[PDB]
Amino acid sequence: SRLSPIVRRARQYIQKHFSQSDLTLESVAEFLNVSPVYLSRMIKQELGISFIHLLTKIRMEKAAELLLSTELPIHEIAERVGYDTQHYFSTAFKKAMGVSPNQYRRTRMISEYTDHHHHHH
């Protein structure tokens, strides 16, 4: 890790607070006490990705984790990753993941508490 202090601090804050639907570039610039334009530029320069894309990526990867490791309904997962409504979450997840939340589960999930032994052998 060789990120500049401001970019490291911003990424740490996003990693902790992505569940907050009011988290914005401008709001992190307030926490860090810096120009939002400076912060936006430094994130893009050092991470190669904009604030919104970084935040969205973190959110969608957490959502994918929750889809596979819990049986939570989609609307709860949406809220836990910073979307007030599944209406916006569904679209964001499809674009980021290439599949709907439900199809992500159908293709990837398994129930760990059921018997998967081959008794027909």
Token pair of 111 as six digits: 């129930």
The answer to whether 4 and 41 have CB atoms below 8 angstroms apart is no
71 phi, psi to nearest 5 deg = -105, 25
Residues 6+ apart with CB under 8 A from 88: 78
Token pair of 33 as six digits: 């006490």
Amino acid making up residue 97? M
The answer to whether 54 and 28 have CB atoms below 8 angstroms apart is no
Domain spans, the chain: 5-108
Find the angle CA(68)-CA(84)-CA(98) to the nearest 5 degrees: 45
Token pair of 4 as six digits: 């500049």
What resolution (Å)? Answer: 1.1
87/80 Cα distance (integer angstroms): 14
- For the chain, helix, strand, coil in percent to 5 are 65, 0, 35
Q: Residue 27, CB half-sphere, CA atoms under 13 Å: how many?
A: 11
83/85 Cα distance (integer angstroms): 5
CATH placement of domain 5-108: 1.10.10.60
60/80 Cα distance (integer angstroms): 11
109 phi, psi to nearest 5 deg = -85, 160
